[PDB]
Enzyme design. Structure first.
Site, PDB file in Angstrom:
ATOM      1  N   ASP A 270       0.692  -1.063   0.091  1.00 33.27           N
ATOM      2  CA  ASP A 270      -0.145  -0.394   0.137  1.00 33.27           C
ATOM      3  C   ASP A 270       1.007   1.055  -0.071  1.00 33.27           C
ATOM      4  O   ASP A 270       0.526   2.267  -0.528  1.00 33.27           O
ATOM      5  CB  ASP A 270      -1.287   0.099   1.298  1.00 33.27           C
ATOM      6  CG  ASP A 270      -1.431   1.280   1.598  1.00 33.27           C
ATOM      7  OD1 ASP A 270      -1.804   2.285   0.290  1.00 33.27           O
ATOM      8  OD2 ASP A 270      -1.849   1.802   2.474  1.00 33.27           O
TER       9      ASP A 270
ATOM     10  N   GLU B  91      -2.135  -4.825  -4.532  1.00 32.92           N
ATOM     11  CA  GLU B  91      -1.067  -4.206  -3.569  1.00 32.92           C
ATOM     12  C   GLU B  91       0.325  -5.282  -3.443  1.00 32.92           C
ATOM     13  O   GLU B  91       1.492  -5.040  -3.399  1.00 32.92           O
ATOM     14  CB  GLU B  91      -1.502  -3.862  -2.828  1.00 32.92           C
ATOM     15  CG  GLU B  91      -2.479  -2.312  -2.863  1.00 32.92           C
ATOM     16  CD  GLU B  91      -3.632  -1.827  -1.375  1.00 32.92           C
ATOM     17  OE1 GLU B  91      -3.443  -2.387  -0.646  1.00 32.92           O
ATOM     18  OE2 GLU B  91      -4.769  -1.600  -1.984  1.00 32.92           O
TER      19      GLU B  91
END
Lengths: 147, 147
Positions: free
Chosen positions: A44, A110
């Site tokens: 992320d 991610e």
């Protein structure tokens, strides 16, 4: 199997340790002991960096007021899902209880980049540039459109 | 007064573009045309990445539950100022109307790191290493510092 790790050809990169790639693609419902959750967490922040770096270089206007909402879209689930298509992650993810969702594909997307990063020897430039070769086009385009 | 950029010595880095260094320590108040605003937007993402990659690497509990509140401590004002104080950045900042704001020396610490990164030629690896060199012992400590 269905998987075969032919994602690396879609990805343009071949993993050293193939356990990495699998951990990124594996949901906790498949495996409680080895799933994407910590890769996701790294991924992320990593991806966020890749996108903020690009955004600040190609945005028509450099004001936080123009950047932040655009940033907001370019790191969203919907956008990540748009980028994951090109890879079609939904073919390689392993999950159990019938709840694949679009937020999971984003999770995995991610986690995947975190996996490439680490499997690369934690080389952010390489990983950054690999992200750019696959998605810069789509990002500049969204930047083009604004909103 | 109290400048002469001993900060490059504090940091262990010499800017090839001193003006770039300058813009990172300058609030709009001192210059509405050349302040830290966009570098800040970049270094937040930048610095977020460096610290998360550390978190995820040295944290005991590699769990989203543990990570994320540990994380928001590390990227917390309190820590950021903690880190900044080893650079005495407070004294090199160029703000008008004597309104420093603890949540302004936080934006400069970020801007400062975006500034090093860009000047370095967009070299993430280098910049992350310099950052660790300067603060990994702290973070690694702050992390094992309970919960």
């Amino acid at each position: 199997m269905k998987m075969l790790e032919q994602l690396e050809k879609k990805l343009g990169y071949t993993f050293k340790d193939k356990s990495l790639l699998e951990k990124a693609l594996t949901h906790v419902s498949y495996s409680k002991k080895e799933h994407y959750e910590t890769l996701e967490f790294l991924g992320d922040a990593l991806v966020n960096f890749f996108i903020v770096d690009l955004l600040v270089q190609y945005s028509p206007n450099k004001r936080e007021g123009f950047l932040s909402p655009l940033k907001a879209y370019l790191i969203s689930e919907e956008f990540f899902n748009l980028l994951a298509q090109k890879l079609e992650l939904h073919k390689f993810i392993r999950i159990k209880r019938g709840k694949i969702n679009e937020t999971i594909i984003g999770d995995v997307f991610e986690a995947l980049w975190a996996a490439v990063y680490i499997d690369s020897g934690r080389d952010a430039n390489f990983t950054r540039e690999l992200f750019y070769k696959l998605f810069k086009e789509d990002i500049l385009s969204a930047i083009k459109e604004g909103r």
